[PDB]
Amino acid sequence: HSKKQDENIVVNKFKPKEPYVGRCLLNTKITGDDAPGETWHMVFSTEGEVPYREGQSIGIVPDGIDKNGKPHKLRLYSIASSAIGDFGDSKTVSLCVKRLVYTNDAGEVVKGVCSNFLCDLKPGSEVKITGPVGKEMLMPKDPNATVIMLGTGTGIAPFRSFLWKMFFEKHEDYQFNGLAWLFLGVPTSSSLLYKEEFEKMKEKAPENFRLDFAVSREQVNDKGEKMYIQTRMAQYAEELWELLKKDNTFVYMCGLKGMEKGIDDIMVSLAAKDGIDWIEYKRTLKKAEQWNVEVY
Numbered sequence: 001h002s003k004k005q006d007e008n009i010v011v012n013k014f015k016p017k018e019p020y021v022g023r024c025l026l027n028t029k030i031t032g033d034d035a036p037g038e039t040w041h042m043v044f045s046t047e048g049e050v051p052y053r054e055g056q057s058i059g060i061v062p063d064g065i066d067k068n069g070k071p072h073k074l075r076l077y078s079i080a081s082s083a084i085g086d087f088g089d090s091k092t093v094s095l096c097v098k099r100l101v102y103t104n105d106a107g108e109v110v111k112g113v114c115s116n117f118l119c120d121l122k123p124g125s126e127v128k129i130t131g132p133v134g135k136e137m138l139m140p141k142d143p144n145a146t147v148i149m150l151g152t153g154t155g156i157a158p159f160r161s162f163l164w165k166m167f168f169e170k171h172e173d174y175q176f177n178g179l180a181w182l183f184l185g186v187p188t189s190s191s192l193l194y195k196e197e198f199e200k201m202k203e204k205a206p207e208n209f210r211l212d213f214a215v216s217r218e219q220v221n222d223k224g225e226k227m228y229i230q231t232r233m234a235q236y237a238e239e240l241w242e243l244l245k246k247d248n249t250f251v252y253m254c255g256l257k258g259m260e261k262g263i264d265d266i267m268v269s270l271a272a273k274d275g276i277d278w279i280e281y282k283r284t285l286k287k288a289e290q291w292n293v294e295v296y
């Protein structure tokens with residue numbers, strides 16, 4: 001008895017103790033050379049063995065041993081493809097990885113373990129996959145629900161999975177006819193991800209898909225304030241609020257951990273104008289499968 005597509009969810013099929021070994025088919029940098037850092041899009045072969053669905057994640061065990069002689073524990077990554085995959089053959093799984101590179105106060109430039117492995121993988125190399133994993137970010141069963149997706153950076157991944165299924169695929173059970181509204185937050189323009197894909201769906205279905213970008217280093221709002229994801233949402237406040245008072249509206253939030261507060265604020269102000277306390281209203285929504293979060 002659930003409002004989400006989960007009838008027969010396969011989960012934890014492959015364990016990190018003995019994971020599924022696949023091959024790297026493709027790996028491409030999808031952010032400009034100008035961007036603040038680089039994000040890559042990669043397609044793995046699973047030969048139909050990893051039974052995932054939209055909204056799930058797989059874990060990856062990077063090659064190597066750690067500082068203390070032991071092999072690396074896994075890292076999770078949202079699946080950036082639909083169930084049938086980028087090739088449509090239901091025999092691939094795709095990821096949206098951000099290359100973690102920074103410098104500690106010791107002055108040293110530090111490279112994240114797993115993300116650099118994934119970003120440095122060459123077509124044909126093997127990758128140890130675990131999972132699938134996840135039940136929170138699953139799609140609503142109702143093919144007419146209003147699906148609002150708020151994401152930042154690589155948080156775009158499960159939403160790209162939703163959209164390829166809703167607007168790029170012909171399925172004899174799922175004929176989406178509701179509203180899908182996407183808000184994507186990024187710094188520079190060279191950081192927008194999958195834009196072409198998203199713009200194509202807009203023109204392909206102007207009635208069912210709404211698309212809003214938020215480039216914080218180049219866009220400004222009313223008062224000349226920086227355009228962060230909540231800033232862009234604000235411009236639709238009264239509407240988003242109205243949609244939230246409806247019962248077939250599902251909100252999804254994925255991406256960098258720090259995005260949740262910014263949005264909360266919006267939601268607070270926006271809730272009181274109707275004489276409501278965001279904090280506990282959100283508690284009811286959550287309990288009703290209508291406010292789903294997966295930031296990290």
Ligand SMILES: Cc1cc2nc3c(=O)[nH]c(=O)nc-3n(C[C@H](O)[C@H](O)[C@H](O)COP(=O)(O)OP(=O)(O)OC[C@H]3O[C@@H](n4cnc5c(N)ncnc54)[C@H](O)[C@@H]3O)c2cc1C
Pocket residue numbers: 057075076077078079096097098099100102103104111112113114115116154155157294296
């Ligand atoms: C549910 C879920 C889904 C995820 N989906 C994605 C996804 O789609 N794409 C994606 O790219 N990532 C995703 N991640 C994050 C991913 O799991 C890894 O954490 C990430 O790729 C970095 O791991 P790493 O092995 O490269 O770095 P590690 O070797 O693990 O090092 C990272 C650690 O270094 C420290 N650190 C990080 N930044 C800094 C800094 N600026 N200064 C100082 N110390 C720092 C932190 O302790 C951090 O935990 C997801 C995480 C979760 C939980």
